[PDB]
Design a protein around this ligand. Structure first.
Ligand code: OW5
Ligand code: MG
Ligand code: ZN
Length: 844
């Protein structure tokens, strides 16, 4: 055994050892219990970053833990290949997106392999390959025929200078982020998934997910935003019907979730697009400008609550059907045309948004709810104003004294009898638009024929192949400028026709890839029936919390779609969900005429730390704040340089030890040094142990007659095995498992293991430690295990807890007072000559 730990020697040999034995190349083996551990597959954007290493290390810890416990473990990897990165790389480098993508894949695949992840590379998929995306084209056509996918006109932000559609997050002050030109809102036909048809299923099935973090479930419930409220109609007043046609001349209809406060409504508010807004504004230039400023707005939903709410009175009036109050209609910028009826009532006393709106414009506030003897201050909001559960109605006439639920049904009965309203269930969730006006994505399998309409490509003709020898312009989607691609013949009539040139939302590829891993070479469908039945669902899923809403909701949706097609046998794709935090790092710059400097290029001073300096020279640097690793502040530490400097095991140890998965991990040079120094110590402990006499059979069985010191070390060992097992299995906190193995070795360090029995216990200690740590640092553990023991480590299995080692010793002595019934004296006085271990007599 080499004296000094040298990872560049041992790590490739171990990787070859695992690969030769094919421990990760798994099949549908009915004799071993399956375990499907999945990390979110990466965008192939060039190189691994520290987030990647953290995520796939967490995945591999859990995989190897289950492997050592005898499961048939599938841990597959692949490439989420379509999307904008390749498009912009094409624009900057004048290379094809595909060629750039396949090169990134080759380089990142090498990096993952050098880290030693126990991955079944025979199940590798790349979603930009027609062998993959043909199957989502297949499902698309099938759902299109059923109407689950449909084509509808929708409005988008057009940038007229850069000639492309822009996401709403990509609009600042009504202008495109790169171009800086005023965006134009335009109506174009687009494709939608009818996800709202599955809203109630998607909402309710969350309750099944007992091993998901509650905050993820809460975020999904809120995103779906189901509510049971009331449709309420207010009759338009005699004087306010000018310019209105239809039922809009008769009433204004609103939806509210608080009909128990209908007695407290003090005004009503409508969207800028509402007919009442249009008729009111026809002779009022200030209203026309307000209507225009609303329509020009572009507020993404994470910013709708954070925008200043503004309104304009219209001079038009409606009547509360329950008390008779004439109420003014306002136009307001928070009422969205498309949600509900584009019209709401306002109760400033019991809705905080209405409170603030009414405070701004000095609109009335009428308290109709009371919670105990709480004082109502019409000038200061209080939390209890919005209380649904423990409130009771006041100032409501014949409704006074009712709680929320019985008031709700009382209002519902009154409204329904006179025809002024009825209960209604609503959902915030919108349908999912999948059209993208972009090149590097899966083609939409629709052929447009002026005789036959929107026609799906027949299954015999799929895939519609994206041509790969394209170098994106900049001036619009290339597919629309390629007659060689879109000029085709119609599949139903055989005449001249045009392919759809929009591509699919790349969220689609990541909504089913976990099923494709089950049979990635299956040419007859999305997933083979036999494989889906064996593998079932993902047992454990690991990824970043930033995917908690959209990606997770889309994947659950696709699972239910595929189940209903008859392809899979599960309702939910992901049983356990572990969300990983971000990686942060200090930032450094230097002022010019700021140019942010990468940390691996900087060197720090010290004392016994003054400042920092650039490695290439010696000019000082500006140490600034710690934040997430990014291109923006050039504070991303290349994982390749960590591996080059210390080896894969040190990289993995640092990430697992520095922070629990949910927590932000802070890059630290000394921390990485600490992890490397522990691996040297681990190496030194085994080497010194074997230097003093070589391996022996590990201690096992009855421990009576072992010295107290060695019994104590066995107690620490088997308590450490139980702790680490609970840390990997239940808590999924890996730092405390490393700490526990560290404590075991510390106790071993202070124990004389030189005797014959001492060596046997030492062998037991070391054979456990290297297996307890193997999921985390498998290369050094693999090599150390082969020096201690000839059996194959994965066949030796997870260390067992020897409960006999956890039973503390017993000695029963009698205690008598005047002849009749240090260590034992203090305990018997807690109940004087002492005959050792047998008897004590309290002579008094
Ligand atoms: C030279 C470049 C320097 C870059 C510097 C840098 C930048 C960022 C971070 C960082 C990020 N996070 C936060 C956690 C990042 C996780 C990384 O692993 C996985 C792959 O991520 S992905 O490839 O983005 N794919 C995807 O997100 C989709 N293909 C997944 C589908 C299933 C939807 C995901 O689970 C991420 O959520 N923490 N740290 C660290 C370093
Ligand atoms: Mg259950
Ligand atoms: Zn036709």
């Amino acid at each position: 055994m080499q004296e000094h730990y040298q990872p560049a020697a041992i790590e490739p040999a171990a990787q070859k050892k695992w690969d030769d034995a094919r421990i990760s190349n798994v099949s549908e083996d009915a004799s071993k219990p399956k375990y499907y551990c999945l990390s979110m597959f990466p965008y192939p954007s060039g190189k691994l970053h520290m987030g990647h290493v953290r995520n796939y290390t967490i995945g591999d810890v859990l995989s190897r833990f289950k492997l050592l416990n005898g499961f048939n473990v599938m841990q597959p990897m692949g490439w989420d290949a379509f999307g904008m990165p390749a498009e912009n790389a094409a624009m900057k480098n004048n290379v094809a997106p595909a060629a750039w993508t396949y090169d990134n894949i080759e380089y990142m695949k090498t990096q993952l392999k050098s880290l030693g992840f126990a991955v079944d590379w025979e199940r590798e998929v790349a979603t930009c390959k027609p062998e993959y995306y043909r199957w989502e084209q297949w499902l698309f056509t099938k759902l299109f025929e059923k109407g689950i996918v449909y084509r509808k006109n929708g409005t988008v932000n057009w940038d007229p200078v850069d000639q492309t559609v822009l996401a709403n997050e990509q609009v600042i002050d009504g202008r495109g982020w790169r171009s800086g030109a005023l965006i134009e809102k335009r109506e174009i036909p687009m494709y939608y998934f009818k996800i709202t048809d599955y809203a109630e299923e998607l909402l309710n099935d969350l309750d099944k997910l007992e091993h998901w973090p509650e905050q993820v479930k809460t975020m999904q419930r809120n995103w779906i935003g189901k509510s049971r409220g009331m449709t309420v109609r207010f009759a338009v007043s005699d004087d306010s019907k000018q310019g209105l046609e239809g039922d809009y001349a008769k009433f204004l209809q609103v939806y509210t979730t608080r009909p128990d406060t209908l007695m407290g409504a003090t005004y009503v508010a409508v969207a800028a697009e509402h007919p009442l807004a249009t008729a009111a504004a026809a002779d009022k230039p200030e209203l026309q400008a307000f209507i225009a400023e609303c329509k020009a707005g572009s507020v993404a939903e994470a910013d709708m609550a954070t925008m200043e709410k503004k309104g304009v009175p219209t001079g038009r009036y409606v009547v509360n059907p329950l008390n008779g109050d004439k109420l003014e209609v306002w136009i307001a910028n928070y009422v969205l045309w498309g949600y509900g009826d584009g019209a709401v009532m306002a109760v400033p006393a019991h809705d905080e948004r209405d409170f603030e709106f009414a405070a701004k414009y000095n609109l009335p506030k009428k308290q109709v709810i009371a919670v105990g003897d709480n004082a109502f201050d019409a000038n200061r909001w209080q939390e209890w104003y919005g209380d649904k559960e423990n409130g009771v109605l006041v100032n409501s006439g014949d409704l006074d004294g009712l709680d929320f639920q019985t008031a709700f049904d009382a209002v519902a009965a009154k409204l329904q009898s006179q025809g002024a309203g009825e209960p209604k269930t609503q959902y915030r969730l919108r349908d999912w638009g999948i059209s993208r006006q972009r090149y590097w994505g899966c083609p939409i399998p629709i052929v447009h024929c002026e005789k036959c309409g929107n026609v799906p490509v027949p299954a015999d003709q799929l895939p519609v192949v994206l041509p790969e020898n394209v170098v994106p312009d900049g001036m619009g989607s290339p597919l629309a400028k390629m007659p060689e691609f879109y000029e085709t013949s119609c599949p139903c009539c055989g005449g001249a026709a045009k392919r759809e040139t929009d591509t699919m939302d790349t969220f689609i590829e990541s909504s089913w890839y976990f099923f494709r891993y089950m049979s990635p070479k299956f040419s007859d469908g999305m997933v083979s029936a036999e494989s889906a039945k064996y593998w079932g669902a993902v047992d454990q899923y690991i990824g970043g919390i930033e995917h908690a809403i959209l990606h997770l909701l889309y994947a659950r949706f696709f699972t239910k779609l595929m189940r209903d097609e008859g392809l899979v046998n599960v309702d939910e794709p992901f049983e356990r969900l572990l969300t990983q935090g971000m990686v942060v790092c200090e930032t450094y710059y230097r002022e010019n005429d700021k140019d942010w400097i990468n940390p691996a290029d900087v060197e720090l001073t010290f004392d016994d730390p003054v400042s920092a300096v650039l490695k290439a020279d010696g000019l000082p640097v500006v140490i600034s704040g710690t934040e997430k690793m990014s291109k923006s502040k050039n504070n991303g530490v290349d994982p390749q340089e960590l591996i080059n400097a210390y080896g894969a095991d040190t990289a993995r140890l640092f990430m697992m030890f520095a922070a629990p998965p949910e927590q932000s991990l802070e890059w630290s040079d000394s921390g990485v040094e600490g992890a490397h120094r522990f691996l040297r110590r681990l190496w030194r402990t085994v080497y010194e142990y074997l230097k003093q006499g070589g391996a022996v059979k590990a201690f096992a069985g009855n421990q009576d007659g072992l010295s107290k010191e060695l019994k104590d070390l066995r107690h620490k060992l088997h308590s450490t095995t139980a702790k680490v097992s609970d840390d990997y299995g239940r808590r999924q906190q890996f730092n405390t498992a490393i700490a526990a193995v560290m404590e075991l070795l510390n106790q071993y360090d202070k124990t004389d293991t030189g005797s014959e029995q001492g060596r046997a216990v030492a062998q037991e200690v070391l054979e456990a430690a290297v297996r307890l740590l193997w999921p985390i640092v498998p290369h050094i553990c693999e090599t150390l295990w082969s020096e201690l023991n000839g059996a194959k480590l994965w066949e030796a299995g997870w260390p067992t807890v020897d409960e006999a080692a956890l039973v503390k010793s017993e000695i029963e002595v009698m205690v008598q007072v005047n002849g009749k019934l240090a260590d034992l004296e203090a305990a018997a006085l807690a109940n004087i000559i002492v005959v050792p271990g047998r008897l004590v007599n309290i002579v008094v």
